[PDB]
Design a protein around this ligand. Structure first.
Ligand SMILES: CCCCCCCCCCCCCCCCCC(=O)OC[C@H](COP(=O)([O-])OCC(O)COP(=O)([O-])OC[C@@H](COC(=O)CCCCCCCCCCCCCCCCC)OC(=O)CCCCCCCCCCCCCCCCC)OC(=O)CCCCCCCCCCCCCCCCC
Ligand SMILES: CCCCCCCCCCCCCCCCCC(=O)OC[C@H](COP(=O)([O-])OCC(O)COP(=O)([O-])OC[C@@H](COC(=O)CCCCCCCCCCCCCCCCC)OC(=O)CCCCCCCCCCCCCCCCC)OC(=O)CCCCCCCCCCCCCCCCC
Ligand SMILES: CCCCCCCCCCCCCCCCCC(=O)OC[C@H](COP(=O)([O-])OCC(O)COP(=O)([O-])OC[C@@H](COC(=O)CCCCCCCCCCCCCCCCC)OC(=O)CCCCCCCCCCCCCCCCC)OC(=O)CCCCCCCCCCCCCCCCC
Ligand SMILES: CCCCCCCCCCCCCCCCCC(=O)OC[C@H](COP(=O)([O-])OCC(O)COP(=O)([O-])OC[C@@H](COC(=O)CCCCCCCCCCCCCCCCC)OC(=O)CCCCCCCCCCCCCCCCC)OC(=O)CCCCCCCCCCCCCCCCC
Ligand SMILES: CCCCCCCCCCCCCCCCCC(=O)OC[C@H](COP(=O)([O-])OCC(O)COP(=O)([O-])OC[C@@H](COC(=O)CCCCCCCCCCCCCCCCC)OC(=O)CCCCCCCCCCCCCCCCC)OC(=O)CCCCCCCCCCCCCCCCC
Ligand SMILES: CCCCCCCC/C=C/CCCCCCCC(=O)OC[C@H](COP(=O)(O)OCCN)OC(=O)CCCCCCC/C=C/CCCCCCCC
Lengths: 119, 50, 99, 62, 37, 68, 133, 61, 65, 119
């Protein structure tokens, strides 16, 4: 689990595997696509996957779930939120049980002890 | 997985499920295209009307 | 695995300029003294070393060359044969190899 | 609206839900792909009608 | 040894007479791939 | 130049040739559409070692020196 | 002034080719086709053209093999099957009768399910009699 | 694991009119019943492998 | 690269897979003003090499030359 | 060292490295290119690198070492002999201290003990 608003982009990249995905920060530009009026505090936009969640609620309050919520600005927020929590759950588990897969871990490329050098 | 499975490997799961549609009108268009090619073969090399 | 992949252990800052990719700066980079300042600083060291650091040098150089040998038994042979019967621990203290 | 998505379930029991929406009797005899054959096949049928446009100018039909 | 230490575990001389019957294994330079066209 | 020491390693292009280096006295030339021979027409098998970086060597010399 | 009569002449010939390509090609090549080469030359044209198209089709298929290999977990530097390094190459079948009699391309429609699959229908005949059908 | 599963050869029909030797020889062949032995892998045809003695004329590319 | 110990499947630099390509300078003035090819004759030995000649001048004086 | 006349070629091919050289048997065809008469027993032609050695001797007896030994049939024998013993010396060492490099060795891809499978 991430206990902050920010995370080093390299700490979630693979060292011995091809990097085909990143774990980007929340896309704040999607918040300005909502045409209606809403109140959002800047203190909630950086934490992972939450901004997409609040946007989904705003869209489900202004519109409903039938024939009015089906507009591009609102469906992309629902998709980003559903996708952000799925990737973060997978990266979080991979961080818990496979920390040696990521850059920055000392077990990705273990440094030998001095007794292993024969000096 | 422990008894009858392999190693747990991380892969990217494609949500897009492609599938080629088995249609009828597609082969009709295909024949029309070859019918033009064959007619040109006849029009150029087996046309004796002039 | 991407062929142009590199793992760097010091921070780098990449320029966000169109059509170009490069390292434009290093975080917390301190500009030291100029080449002329270091030149003047070194000449003061070489000048003193030329005037006051040339007596009794032939002995210290032989000790230094003996300690550049592979095995210890050859060093003791070099000291006793070339350096006039010197001691291993006593010569290592002169050269500054002792703690 | 979330409670409206579950309206057809509140009138049913769990056994009825399973037999209704889960345990659909297998029947693999339908031409399911007819939906696409009709849609995409319409471009050809529409072309047969559209190629007869009475527009005089050739470049207008272009 | 000669003013040098090489740390090694206790050597087992019994491993010398280890019965290892040779097994057949042929390498084929020129074989089969995973997929073909 | 002497005939290269027989080497059965080869690479086919059009069809499998079943090249046998012992079937001919002199090695036939390599045609582009027929075969490519192994590298090192005149080569032997040796064992070599990379030279560690100079600064890494100086740290090893200083450790042994401070050790003895 | 320019020759405003030649305006949009390229667009117009393009639409006529689309309307009736065989007629546009026939009449634009009539005076040239008056001098017809021999059967040998005409055959060489067709043979070399269709052979080039046949190899183009095989290269399209080999690209789908490289894409499947990429999806399967093998990154690919470069492209094609002209292996620069220490690998065997497989050039296209030479389009001459010698190789066309010894070799023939793999027909995928000949790779089948084993007919032993049909012996599972024996279960159906037995269950029907067990249930009194 | 994927490479290993892929070498398990598939089934390729013996019928072949593209190779002129089989086009002639198969006109005199007698189709005999292949009695089921209880398996789903009976190689009653040739195998889709370049090294098979009945498929070496086929170009696997 | 082959001789250095890396076998090469295929050829060229048009990487089909997950790699960066570099197509070549478009032969138009826009890119010809921003980019220029690497001139190998500009890669040089460091002139500090010439400072080793100081050893020669000092030896010549020691030997009385 | 090889204590026989025949050796399995696969036993001298690498399992985890590209195979760019083989350890071929003696080239008996080069023995027929010597124009002069000589006596050779079939019991000495299979042992590694010895045929090329005897041929070099036969050529150094008929001819000398100056202006007459310099013919293609005699120089290729001397080059083969010198090259055969160098390759065999390296392969023999590699077989002694790097047996895991070759096919057929149980250490190239070790089979695990049943205690490591967790059953
Ligand atoms: C007695 C005299 C008559 C008096 C009555 C007068 C009143 C007449 C009208 C009422 C009766 C109509 C009968 C049919 C019932 C239709 C009811 C209806 O609601 O239809 C609306 C119908 C559907 O609306 P839609 O949902 O928007 O679907 C069209 C979309 O384009 C679709 O786009 P898409 O992407 O969503 O889908 C692609 C689509 C394919 O869509 C396309 O590709 C077509 C796109 C149009 C061309 C692209 C350019 C469009 C440019 C935009 C502007 C166009 C304006 C056109 C305005 C036309 C106004 C009508 O493919 C399909 O989805 C399935 C197609 C397969 C259907 C197969 C045909 C079944 C029809 C029945 C066949 C038997 C009828 C007789 C056969 C025809 C006569 C020989 O609208 C249209 O009809 C569109 C025009 C299509 C041309 C039809 C012309 C037929 C005229 C026949 C007249 C009667 C015979 C005359 C005999 C003369 C002697 C008497
Ligand atoms: C405040 C915000 C503002 C926002 C809006 C900003 C927009 C600014 C608007 C102001 C710009 C226009 C200024 C007015 C121009 C007045 C000049 C004039 O008097 O007419 C000259 C020009 C002269 O033509 P012409 O004398 O009748 O005869 C031409 C010759 O015969 C030659 O014909 P040809 O048969 O002999 O064949 C040669 C021909 C054709 O040769 C070709 O092969 C080229 C084919 C190009 C199209 C196809 C490309 C390939 C890809 C598609 C494949 C399609 C075919 C596939 C076939 C099926 C395949 C199975 O060569 C040409 O390219 C002809 C082009 C016309 C000459 C102009 C000089 C071009 C030189 C540069 C060439 C490279 C550019 C090509 C551009 C495309 C031109 C069509 O006539 C015009 O075209 C006037 C065009 C002005 C239309 C304005 C319409 C309203 C604009 C606003 C609407 C909203 C726009 C919103 C945009 C939003 C942002 C994206
Ligand atoms: C350069 C080297 C590389 C070349 C690469 C290959 C080039 C492309 C190859 C394409 C071949 C496809 C052939 C299709 C069937 C043609 C069969 C036929 O009998 O032809 C007559 C046939 C006309 O017969 P028709 O149906 O009775 O129409 C007459 C009516 O009076 C028409 O009434 P209208 O006069 O009032 O209409 C105005 C007229 C003139 O106006 C124009 O056409 C100009 C603007 C047209 C739009 C631009 C076309 C863009 C491409 C079309 C859309 C994508 C492909 C659609 C599928 C096409 C394949 C069937 O329109 C037409 O000409 C006919 C309509 C054109 C098609 C437009 C609708 C497209 C959608 C089709 C929907 C129905 C099919 C269902 C979907 C199928 C897919 C699953 O021609 C066509 O329909 C189109 C042929 C297109 C050929 C273009 C290139 C030909 C020359 C290639 C040369 C190759 C090099 C070797 C030469 C060696 C020489 C030494
Ligand atoms: C989108 C894809 C793009 C890529 C592909 C692009 C493909 C473009 C091709 C487009 C068409 C080419 C241009 C043709 C112009 C229109 C026809 C014409 O020429 O007017 C008639 C006129 C004379 O013919 P005529 O008036 O009917 O008189 C003949 C008598 O009636 C009766 O005959 P005769 O007794 O007076 O003499 C015997 C006979 C001699 O017999 C022959 O006709 C010789 C042809 C034998 C078959 C050759 C194989 C078929 C080639 C096509 C298949 C390509 C294979 C794959 C290529 C892989 C590598 C790319 O003479 C002829 O009948 C005509 C020979 C004149 C040469 C014909 C033009 C060159 C061959 C076609 C070029 C093919 C290029 C395809 C790929 C290009 C990629 C860049 O020809 C001329 O224009 C004279 C030009 C001078 C030609 C002699 C010197 C040429 C030296 C350059 C040779 C280039 C070879 C290229 C090899 C390609 C790679 C292997
Ligand atoms: C009772 C006595 C016998 C009576 C027999 C009855 C005869 C009836 C004649 C019926 C005529 C049919 C009319 C309709 C066809 C007309 C259309 C046509 O294409 O004619 C060519 C026609 C006329 O061309 P031309 O420039 O006036 O030259 C005329 C002659 O070629 C002359 O050219 P030349 O003056 O320069 O002479 C040089 C000659 C020089 O030739 C020689 O000096 C010796 C030839 C030795 C051949 C050695 C063969 C070795 C074979 C080795 C193969 C081993 C592999 C086997 C595999 C086994 C596997 C285990 O070389 C050639 O001409 C090559 C011509 C190719 C001939 C291919 C057939 C050869 C054998 C035919 C045997 C028929 C029985 C005759 C028995 C007579 C015995 C005395 O070409 C065209 O311009 C029309 C378009 C052609 C487009 C190309 C695609 C056409 C293919 C489809 C055609 C239609 C369907 C199939 C028809 C049959 C085609 C073979
Ligand atoms: C198109 C050929 C017509 C003439 C052919 C003559 C030769 C006849 C030989 C036929 C041999 C019989 C072989 C078996 C045929 C199988 C047909 C098939 O697979 O599709 C059947 C399938 C039945 O649907 P299911 O319920 O899903 O399947 C249940 C299965 N029991 O039929 C369909 O797919 C529906 C579409 C059938 C074709 C439709 C014709 C399209 C033409 C449209 C224009 C007609 C006018 C429309 C006016 C609209 C007015 C509102």
């Amino acid at each position: 689990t991430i206990f902050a608003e920010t995370w080093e982009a390299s700490e979630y990249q693979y060292r011995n595997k091809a990097n085909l995905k990143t774990l980007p920060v929340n896309h704040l530009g999607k918040l300005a696509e909502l045409k209606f009026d809403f109140v959002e505090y800047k203190a909630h936009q950086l934490i992972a996957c939450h901004l997409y969640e609040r946007m989904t609620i705003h869209c489900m309050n202004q519109y409903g779930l039938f024939k009015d919520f089906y507009r591009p600005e609102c469906l992309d927020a629902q998709y980003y939120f559903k996708t952000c929590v799925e990737l973060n759950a997978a990266y979080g588990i991979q961080k818990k049980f496979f920390p040696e897969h990521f850059v920055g871990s000392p077990y990705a490329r273990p440094v030998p002890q001095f007794q292993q050098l024969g000096l | 997985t422990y008894f009858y499975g392999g190693i747990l490997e991380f892969v990217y799961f494609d949500k897009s499920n492609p599938d080629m549609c088995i249609l009828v009108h597609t082969l009709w268009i295909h024949l029309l295209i070859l019918f033009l090619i064959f007619t040109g073969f006849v029009t150029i090399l087996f046309s004796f009307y002039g | 695995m991407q062929n142009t992949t590199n793992i760097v252990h010091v921070p780098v800052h990449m320029g966000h300029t169109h059509y170009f990719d490069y390292i434009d700066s290093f975080p917390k980079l301190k500009e030291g003294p100029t080449l002329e300042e270091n030149h003047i600083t070194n000449q003061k060291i070489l000048r003193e070393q030329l005037i006051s650091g040339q007596q009794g040098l032939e002995q210290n150089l032989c000790l230094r060359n003996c300690f550049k040998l592979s095995q210890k038994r050859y060093i003791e042979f070099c000291l006793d044969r070339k350096c006039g019967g010197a001691d291993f621990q006593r010569a290592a203290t002169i050269l500054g190899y002792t703690k | 609206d979330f409670a409206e998505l579950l309206r057809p379930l509140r009138s049913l029991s769990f056994n009825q839900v399973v037999d209704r929406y889960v345990l659909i009797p297998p029947n693999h005899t339908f031409y399911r792909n007819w939906t696409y054959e009709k849609f995409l096949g319409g471009f050809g049928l529409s072309y047969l009608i559209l190629r007869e446009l009475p527009l005089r100018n050739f470049y207008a039909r272009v | 040894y000669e003013d040098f230490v090489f740390t090694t575990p206790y050597f087992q001389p019994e491993s010398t007479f280890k019965s290892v019957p040779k097994l057949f294994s042929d390498i084929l330079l020129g074989g089969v791939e995973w997929v073909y066209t | 130049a002497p005939n290269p020491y027989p080497n059965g390693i080869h690479f086919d292009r059009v069809f499998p040739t079943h090249y046998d280096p012992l079937a001919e006295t002199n090695r036939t030339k390599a045609n582009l559409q027929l075969i490519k021979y192994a590298p090192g027409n005149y080569s032997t098998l040796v064992v070599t070692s990379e030279k560690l970086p100079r600064p890494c060597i100086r740290t090893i010399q200083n450790y042994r020196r401070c050790q003895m | 002034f320019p020759d405003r009569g030649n305006k949009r002449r390229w667009f117009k010939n393009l639409f006529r080719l689309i309307k009736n390509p065989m007629g546009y090609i026939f009449w634009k090549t009539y005076k040239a086709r008056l001098a017809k080469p021999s059967l040998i030359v005409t055959s060489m044209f067709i043979g070399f053209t269709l052979g080039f198209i046949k190899l183009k089709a095989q290269s399209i298929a080999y690209s789908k093999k490289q894409y499947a290999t990429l999806r399967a977990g093998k990154n690919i530097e470069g492209s094609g099957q002209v292996h620069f390094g220490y690998h065997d190459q497989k050039w296209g079948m030479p389009a001459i009768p010698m190789f066309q009699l010894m070799y023939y391309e793999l027909p995928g429609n000949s790779i089948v399910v084993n007919p032993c699959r049909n012996q599972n229908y024996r279960l159906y005949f037995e269950m029907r009699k067990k249930l009194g059908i | 694991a994927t490479r290993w599963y892929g070498r398990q050869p598939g089934h390729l029909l013996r019928a072949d009119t593209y190779w002129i030797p089989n086009l002639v020889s198969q006109r005199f062949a007698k189709h005999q019943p292949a009695h089921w032995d209880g398996t789903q892998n009976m190689p009653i045809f040739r195998l889709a492998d370049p090294k098979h003695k009945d498929s070496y004329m086929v170009q696997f590319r």
